[PDB]
């Protein structure tokens, strides 16, 4: 259902928020591609906020999916789900308690997002996978995976 919206993208993953909106991590988008999903790159309207990368296609690409709510992170303390897809195809939902929103230094670079704590991990191929949580009856996507700290269970969710 939601898992079909996570797709192989460059060195990582990306997520269909809607038929026309695809988000991923700046570290993962292929910089030399001439088209994405058959659409020439010039027709694709791309925005970048640090490690958050959103792609707006001129025409619906995934007509089978419904638009999902995209917000800038989650209320502090929200237990979200990092929806990890592995190249083996295995689905690995990882619970993460979301922490402070901040402008953070990560390997010298500035990135905007939200810290989280894996509850009970993540690997270099996992960047771009989405963080999601359920509010009422609505699913809400809050960002994409971009980093995880060594010597700890902290993960970084890049946000808009
Ligand atoms: C995914 C992207 C990737 O592979 O990039 C290579 C071009 C990858 C996922 C993490 C790898 C280990 N586990 C993961 O979940 N992301 C990265 O490698 C980013 C860098 C890191 O994750 C480092 N983490 C940190 O520096 C850090 C600091 C804090 C508070 O938390 N984490 C190491 C653990 C490797 C790539 C990146 C992201 C954003 C940047 F601004 C610079 C670099």
Active site residue ranges: 27, 51, 127
Distance 64 CA to ligand 1 centre (A): 33
Closest C-alpha to 113, from 69, 153, 148, 152: 148
In this structure, which CATH number among 3.40.605.10, 3.40.50.970, 1.20.1300.10, 2.40.10.10 belongs to the domain 69-158? 2.40.10.10
Does 127 sit in the ligand 1 pocket, CB within 6 Å?
Answer: yes
- Distances, alpha carbon 144 to alpha carbons 17, 40, 129, in Å: 11, 24, 5
Secondary structure letter of residue 102 according to DSSP? E
34: left (phi over 0), alpha (psi -120 to 50) or beta: alpha
In a 13 Å sphere around the CA of 114, the CA atoms on its Cβ side amount to 29
Task: Give the technique used to solve this structure.
Answer: X-ray
Resolution of this deposited model, Å:
2.0
Q: Report domain extents, the chain.
A: 3-56, 69-158
CA pair distance 42, 35, nearest whole angstrom? 8
How many CB atoms within 10 Å of residue 86?
Answer: 13
Ligand 1 close to Cβ of residue 27 (< 6 A) = yes
- Between the CA of 151 and the centroid of ligand 1 the distance, in Å, is 13
Question: One fold for both 3-56 and 69-158?
Answer: yes
Cα(22)–Cα(16) distance, rounded to whole angstroms?
4
- Other CB atoms within 10 A of residue 81 CB: 16
| Fold assignment, 3-56 | Thrombin, subunit H (2.40.10)
Protein residue whose Cα sits closest to atom 17 of ligand 1: 147
In 3D space, the residue among 69, 2, 55, 66 whose CA is nearest the CA of residue 24 turns out to be: 55
116 Cα: distance to centroid of ligand 1 (angstroms): 14
Task: List b or e across 70-80, with b for residues whose CB sees 16 or more CB atoms inside 10 angstroms.
Answer: beebbeeebeb
Rg (CA), the chain: 15
- Ligand 1 pocket test: which of 105, 107, 157 has the largest number of ligand atoms within 8 Å of its C-beta? 107
Q: Is the CB of 150 under 6 A from ligand 1?
A: yes
Nearest atom (ligand 1) to Cα of 147: 22
Q: Which atom of ligand 1 is nearest to the CA of 156?
A: 31
Task: Report the distance separating Cα 22 and Cα 10, nearest Å.
Answer: 13
């Amino acid at each position: 259902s939601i898992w079909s919206r996570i797709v192989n993208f460059g060195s990582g993953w990306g997520f269909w928020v809607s038929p026309s909106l695809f988000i991923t991590s700046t570290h993962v988008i292929p910089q030399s591609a001439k088209e994405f999903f058959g659409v020439p790159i010039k027709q694709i309207q791309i925005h970048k906020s640090g490690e958050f990368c959103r792609l707006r296609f001129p025409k619906p690409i995934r007509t089978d999916v419904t638009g999902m709510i995209l917000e800038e992170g989650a209320p502090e303390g929200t237990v979200a789900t990092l929806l990890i897809k592995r190249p083996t195809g295995e689905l690995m939902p990882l619970a993460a308690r979301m922490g402070t929103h901040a402008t953070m230094k990560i390997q010298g670079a500035t990135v905007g997002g939200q810290m989280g704590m894996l509850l009970t991990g993540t690997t270099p191929g996992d960047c771009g996978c989405p963080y999601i949580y359920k509010r009422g009856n609505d699913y809400v996507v809050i960002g994409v995976h971009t980093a995880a700290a060594r010597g700890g269970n902290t993960v970084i969710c890049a946000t808009q």
